[PDB]
Design a protein around this ligand. Structure first.
Ligand SMILES: [Zn+2]
Length: 257
């Protein structure tokens, strides 16, 4: 019964998921004055030409755009990573107000939203096996600010009415996740966790410095989604973000000078 409400939000998750207080929790604040350039980092390689989106699902916590991950169709490589990581889904976290919504922060700045493209390490065979490994996942995080519309997001926006409530899914084929990337692939990276229960410490985080712009109308449509199921009291799906967690014995590395 974890969530983002008045009585089940992030500050409560540790009772059922004690790693919530662990050594490698996410998100974190990215201090641009202490993150150090690492010349040994490599460009990243985002290969989404062959991506097969399948479906979009309201899971009661966010919505996931799901992909075929039964081949190396959409992979992330390079950067801080060893080996190959398959895209399985992307989702967002967002606010009730434009001044909030992101999970990671940059010098304490909150963005309006944050996109997570989730990939699993093919060495481990399946996502469920991967989340049990410290190097099981690579999550590419992208900040959203409110300004211009993002044309490549509109198809997502326009399907949300069909998945308003928890448990609803819709066919969602032929979506191109390249339309959600900023121009630059400069990034910060650090080791951390899933930001939702079970909060497993299995993630190499790769957070892009350049935000994307979305329009106020696009974010407004995200804020019409519901946490609840159909036939239940309406609870708008807003403020589905976990706040920054202690960095502890970690360093954030920058790919850029
Ligand atoms: Zn996420």
């Amino acid at each position: 019964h974890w969530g983002y409400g008045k009585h089940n939000g992030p500050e409560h998750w540790h009772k059922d998921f004690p790693i919530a207080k662990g050594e490698r929790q996410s998100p974190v604040d990215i201090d641009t004055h202490t993150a150090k350039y690492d010349p040994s980092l490599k460009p990243l390689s985002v290969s989404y030409d062959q991506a097969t989106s399948l479906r979009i699902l309201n899971n009661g916590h966010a919505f996931n755009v799901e992909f075929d991950d039964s081949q190396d169709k959409a992979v992330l490589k390079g950067g801080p990573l060893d080996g190959t990581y398959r895209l399985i889904q992307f989702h967002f976290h967002w606010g009730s107000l434009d001044g909030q919504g992101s999970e990671h922060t940059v010098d304490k700045k909150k963005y309006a939203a944050e996109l997570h493209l989730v990939h699993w390490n093919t060495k481990y065979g399946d996502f469920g096996k991967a989340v049990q490994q410290p190097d099981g996942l690579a999550i590419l995080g992208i900040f959203l600010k409110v300004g211009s519309a993002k044309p490549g997001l509109q198809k997502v926006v326009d399907v949300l009415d069909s998945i308003k409530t928890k448990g609803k899914s819709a066919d969602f084929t032929n979506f191109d996740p390249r339309g959600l990337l900023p121009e630059s692939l400069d990034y910060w990276t650090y080791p951390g966790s899933l930001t939702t229960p079970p909060l497993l410490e299995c993630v190499t985080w790769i957070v892009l410095k350049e935000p994307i712009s979305v329009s106020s109308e696009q974010v407004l449509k995200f804020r019409k989604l519901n946490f609840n199921g159909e036939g239940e009291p309406e609870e708008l799906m807003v403020d589905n973000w976990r706040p920054a967690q202690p960095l502890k014995n970690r360093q954030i590395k920058a790919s850029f000078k």
